[PDB]
Amino acid sequence: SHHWGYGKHNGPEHWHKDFPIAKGERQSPVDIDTHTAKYDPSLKPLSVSYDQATSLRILNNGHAFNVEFDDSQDKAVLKGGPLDGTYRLIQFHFHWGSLDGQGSEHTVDKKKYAAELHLVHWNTKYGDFGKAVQQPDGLAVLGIFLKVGSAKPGLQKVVDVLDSIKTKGKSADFTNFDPRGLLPESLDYWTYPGSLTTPPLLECVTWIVLKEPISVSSEQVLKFRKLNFNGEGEPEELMVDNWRPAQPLKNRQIKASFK
Numbered sequence: 682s683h684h685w686g687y688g689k690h691n692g693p694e695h696w697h698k699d700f701p702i703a704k705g706e707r708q709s710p711v712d713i714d715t716h717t718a719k720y721d722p723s724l725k726p727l728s729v730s731y732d733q734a735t736s737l738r739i740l741n742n743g744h745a746f747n748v749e750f751d752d753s754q755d756k757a758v759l760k761g762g763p764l765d766g767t768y769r770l771i772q773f774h775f776h777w778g779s780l781d782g783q784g785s786e787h788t789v790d791k792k793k794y795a796a797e798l799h800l801v802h803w804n805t806k807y808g809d810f811g812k813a814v815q816q817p818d819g820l821a822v823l824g825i826f827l828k829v830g831s832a833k834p835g836l837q838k839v840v841d842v843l844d845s846i847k848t849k850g851k852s853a854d855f856t857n858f859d860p861r862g863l864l865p866e867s868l869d870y871w872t873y874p875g876s877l878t879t880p881p882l883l884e885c886v887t888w889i890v891l892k893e894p895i896s897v898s899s900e901q902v903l904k905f906r907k908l909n910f911n912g913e914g915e916p917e918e919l920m921v922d923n924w925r926p927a928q929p930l931k932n933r934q935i936k937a938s939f940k
């Protein structure tokens with residue numbers, strides 16, 4: 682440690698020293714054992730309403746890049762599934778690897794994907810993001826896996842702006858991006874109660890992990906690997922492998938929306 686990161690000296694195995702909740706009872710990510718996940722017919726279909734989404738900016742925060750959305754009103758929301766209430770989209774970001782064989786946070790039957798997209802939403806009953814993180818049902822994160830295959834056209838606008846936010850603290854205007862181009866065809870999912878996967882690791886997330894991965898091209902993922910963890914004019918450390926390994930499931934059941 683000193684500030685946390687993904688290196689040898691401040692990586693996930695060290696987080697517990699500054700954030701004791703790292704060894705909590707509802708930590709994320711986890712491995713999804715498909716044969717043990719319970720089909721639950723009481724789960725409703727997810728409802729994604731992203732047609733009025735307003736993207737604002739893209740920022741390199743030193744551990745990933747976030748695309749942020751205007752969440753001052755009910756423009757891009759998620760509801761249904763295992764959720765009660767309306768969850769507003771605030772930001773999305775990815776986790777990726779130094780090689781195609783790793784990168785995702787969640788695994789499926791121990792399979793790791795090249796990357797993992799997180800769409801972050803907060804429960805509107807709490808009024809703001811900072812209050813939602815303090816509640817057991819404060820956030821809803823939709824996780825989508827990426828496999829390397831064909832290019833994903835709806836991801837290119839993202840890939841193209843990375844050069845302008847190469848180093849930590851850099852940001853760029855990023856209006857009119859439509860997150861609908863990042864969804865797979867099927868919205869079948871697994872769900873379980875967990876946490877944020879970076880410090881502060883708060884246990885306030887209802888995870889909704891989609892069964893169907895989207896494919897990206899190798900060239901697309903390559904550009905992610907060109908970003909830097911460091912700030913401008915500091916020694917160069919490529920932003921790769923910014924994923925936390927799977928944590929113990931403990932007393933939790935993974936439910937499936939399908940069989």
Ligand SMILES: [S]
Pocket residue numbers: 799877878879
């Ligand atoms: S995350």
Ligand SMILES: [Zn+2]
Pocket residue numbers: 774775776799878
């Ligand atoms: Zn994440």
